[PDB]
Amino acid sequence: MIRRGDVYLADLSPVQGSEQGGVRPVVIIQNDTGNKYSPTVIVAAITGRINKAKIPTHVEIEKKKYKLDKDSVILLEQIRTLDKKRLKEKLTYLSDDKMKEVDNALMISLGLNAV
């Protein structure tokens, strides 16, 4: 079952310019009716390139709790609809508190900030 808050390995290549590419973890951010009843998910990329949030659309995740190669950052400015066939293995699942920070950074990202 694909749940919002799941983190999967996914090949994001090919990409252009500053789009995040590579085989990497991504977190599911699509609502759960969409995850269940549609062939696509929306995800946010995760990078181990940095371990500290630089901007308010970044959210940190710790390797000790989440089974990643490295302390990492979720990039809510790099979001994409992905076909489900791009999801490889299921790495982890984020806590409810981690998902609140994600909800926040995503509202800032999309200017929904006027809640």
Add this chain to the structure above:
Amino acid sequence: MIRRGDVYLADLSPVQGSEQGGVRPVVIIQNDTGNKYSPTVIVAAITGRINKAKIPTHVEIEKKKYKLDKDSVILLEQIRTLDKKRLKEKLTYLSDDKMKEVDNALMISLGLNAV
């Protein structure tokens, strides 16, 4: 000078599975701080294959007022982060009212619902 609510022509290809592909209009949904400073924008795909919003993640836009080929639909479940270089000509920009429907559909799409 890209701004939230602008509509551009952009090339989405190559894609996989049910990801929207091809050269087509997209609406900018990224916050304006990111549009000013970032090398990437976040967009939602527009399609003319349908003209009516069947689901609450779809927003109808009218052809004459927005200068499109057909009565179209913004697909808030088809989102992409694109390098600015993918954006060809600006086509139009959505009204504030219409942008509010877009925001509602996006809350639902990304499960920020309750907000």
